[PDB]
Structure formats: structure tokens, C-alpha cells
């Protein structure tokens, strides 16, 4: 039972380091969801010209890129933590019996799962639109952000009673 | 920079050593160390006793 | 008893030094940051709600 | 976002309840609800009754 | 756990530290210029109209 | 006791049923070994007594 408990809780900090590397990951994406809900709103503007409304929408396709590159790029190591291989959850096993083991999951979180990989903002109803799926993806990753931040306060009180 | 702060963090917790755990068993074999030579030491002598009986 | 295999106290002050060592690694974190949510962790209803008034 | 933390603690109390042992035998499921007694005296009937609920 | 090898309070430190600076250089160039927007870093579609009406 | 006649000589680790059955075959080994000593142990007491006697 002793020996058990020791690597039952070298297992449950792996899995805080686990989470803790994706929630930090979807930050940046957050972030760079509000810079183009900005860039959105800018282009709602009756003295935008073609050519000022193609700015902004190049800036929105820069931003776009950067998040399915967050969403393909983060791992632990060498395994992929953002790109699906997570949605059915691993388990670590923190206790010394078997079954006495936590769930992580985290889903897919990139420019396609989001639905954010084909804005426009050329016309009125496509600024709604794109207004719209911006806010849903805002969302969709505070949901996963509060998933992991409840697993990590869980793991926690595991090792202390460990 | 972020991924790099968590990822060295993790990796401390794997490769790194515990200073408060592992600075009492240093001096749990230390005592284990004195006690066991006084012992030997004891042992040592036990074939004195044929001595008496001759 | 007298024994010198296993040490009680030292697992204890362990543990507790242990405690006290992070807690002030979050009070260092949250002074050199100026904020009080810094991930999830912290407080997960109100990361979302001020994601919405930073809207 | 409130609930789906709560339900993770509840979950956690649940395993803490059925999770503690002295070595294999369970303690905080039911076995020691009617208490068991340990012998503290050299003769028959001298014992004490340790009672645990679920 | 008490480590000497690595330190990660001072990674996330420096982290915090180096983006202040980077603000404040940000600032002061923005009131020696009296310029908002100095690149299109800052604002690339208010450049372009802005050179319109500049012409 | 061999590692043929305790059953652990073919465990495997690649999925969760083979870990599973990986430790409980393992903590039967333990077992079994403990009930030998047993045996063996109470017969050194009875031929120390038996010595006595004699």
C-alpha cells in the first residue's frame, strides 16, 4: 500500500502537468478570438472601401492560421494534446488498487472544430455571421477551460489525502 | 514561453530530487551506519568464550 | 518506542513545509502578475463572465 | 460552470469514501458500522469496540 | 517539493516582466511621435485610408 | 516456486485488461509465498521445542 500511494502520486501530478499544458495552450486562442471580434466590428463601417475591407479580412485569415497551428502544435513531448486524441479521456491510475484512477479529456480545438476557418466580411449578413461564430467560439473554449481547471482543483485534493 | 514554462516544470517533477526527503534518509543510514559497526565490533569477540572453558 | 527505521515527525514537517511553499509561490505569482484569475484554477465561473464584459 | 465543479468535488468525496483501507480491508464503506472489538487485556471479555459508519 | 535545479516562479517572472517593458517602450514612442499609428503593426486598414486623405 | 508455478511468467502491460490482470495475478504470488514462510516458520518453532526436549 505505501509503494502504491508513491506512484499513485507521481501519476496524478503527471496528469495536473497534462492539463495544465492544454489550458494554458487555449489563452492565445481566446485572445486571438477578441482580436478578430474587433476586427469584425471594424468592418461594420459605411466609409470602408474593397480595399480597407480587404485588409482586415487578410488579418483575419492571419489570425485564423495561427489558431489551427496552436490547435495541431501543443503536445507533452511528442504526444498531441489538442487534436483529438484526448476526447475519449485517458486515465491515471492515483491510487495502489486497481480502478482507483482520474478521467482527462479534452476535445478538438482548431480553426475547423470551431467553425471559424471561413469568415468573411464582405457584406452585411456575412458580418453577422461571422459576429455570431466568433462569440459561439469564445464559448465553447471557456466550457473546456472550466472542465480542466475543475479536474486540476480535484487532483489536488487527491495528493494532499494521498 | 508559456509551453516552455510548463514543460520544464514537468520535467522538473520527474528528474529533479526532493531535498527534505531525501536529506532524512541520508541521515537514517548514517545512524544505520554507527549502530551496525558498534554491532560488528560486538560480534567479533564471541569466540572468547572457549578461552573461559579452557 | 526508540526506532530508527521510520521517522513519523519528519513525514509530517515534510508535508507541511511542502504546503507553505506553494501557497507562496501563488501569492508571488499573483503579485508579479496583477491578477487575481490567472487560469482556471483560480475561479471559473468569473473567467468567463469577464471574458464577456472584456467583449 | 459552478455545477460542473461541484460535481467533480462530489465525485471526490465518493472516492475518498470507498477508497480508504488499512492495507486491503475497507474502512469508510460499512465493514465497521457494528464495531469490532480487539482484545486489550490478558483475559476473555476485556476488549474495546472501534465503530466507523459509512 | 524543494528543488534546485529548476524554478519555474522565476520563469513566469521574467515572463511578466518583459511584457510590462515591452509596453511601456510601446508608450513612449507613441507620445514622442504624437502618432497613433507608427506601423501597420498598429492599424493597417486606417493606414490606407489615412494615406487617401492624405493625398 | 518458480516464476511458472506462481504465474507471472507471461504478463503483459499494452492494454488495460492485461494490466489489470497483470496485478492481480501478481498479488496472488505475494500470497502464496506468504503462506509458505508460514509453514516453514512454524516448523523451526516446533524443533526448537522438539531440541529442548530432547
Not at chain 1, 504526444?79 to 482507483?100: H, I, M, P, R
Not at chain 3, 508571488?28 to 471559473?44: F, H, T
Request: aromatic fraction near 2%; charge should be neutral.
Amino acid at each position: 500500500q505505501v509503494r502504491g500511494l508513491e506512484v499513485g502520486m507521481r501519476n496524478a501530478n503527471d496528469a495536473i502537468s497534462i492539463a495544465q499544458i492544454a489550458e494554458g495552450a487555449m489563452q492565445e486562442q481566446t485572445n486571438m478570438l477578441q482580436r478578430m471580434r474587433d476586427l469584425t466590428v471594424q468592418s461594420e463601417n459605411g466609409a470602408n472601401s474593397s480595399a480597407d475591407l480587404s485588409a482586415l479580412k487578410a488579418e483575419m485569415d492571419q489570425l485564423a492560421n495561427e489558431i489551427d497551428e496552436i490547435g495541431k502544435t501543443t503536445a507533452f513531448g511528442t504526444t498531441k494534446l489538442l487534436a483529438g486524441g484526448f476526447s475519449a479521456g485517458k486515465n491515471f491510475q492515483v491510487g495502489a488498487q486497481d480502478g482507483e484512477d482520474i478521467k482527462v479529456t479534452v476535445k478538438a480545438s482548431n480553426k475547423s472544430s470551431l467553425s471559424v476557418g471561413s469568415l468573411g466580411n464582405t457584406t452585411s449578413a456575412a458580418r453577422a455571421s461571422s459576429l455570431k461564430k466568433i462569440d459561439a467560439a469564445i464559448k465553447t473554449i471557456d466550457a473546456q477551460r472550466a472542465d480542466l481547471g475543475a479536474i486540476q482543483n480535484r487532483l489536488a485534493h487527491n495528493i494532499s489525502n494521498s | 514561453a508559456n509551453t516552455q514554462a510548463n514543460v520544464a516544470d514537468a520535467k522538473s517533477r520527474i528528474v529533479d530530487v526532493d531535498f527534505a526527503k531525501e536529506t532524512s534518509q541520508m541521515t537514517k543510514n548514517q545512524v544505520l551506519q554507527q549502530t551496525g559497526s558498534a554491532m560488528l565490533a560486538q560480534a567479533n569477540q564471541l569466540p572468547q568464550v572457549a578461552l573461559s572453558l579452557l | 518506542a526508540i526506532t530508527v527505521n521510520t521517522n513519523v515527525t519528519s513525514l509530517k514537517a515534510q508535508k507541511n513545509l511542502n504546503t507553505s511553499a506553494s501557497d507562496l509561490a501563488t501569492s508571488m505569482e499573483r503579485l508579479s502578475s496583477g491578477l487575481r484569475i490567472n487560469s482556471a484554477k483560480d475561479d471559473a465561473a468569473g473567467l468567463a463572465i469577464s471574458n464577456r464584459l472584456n467583449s
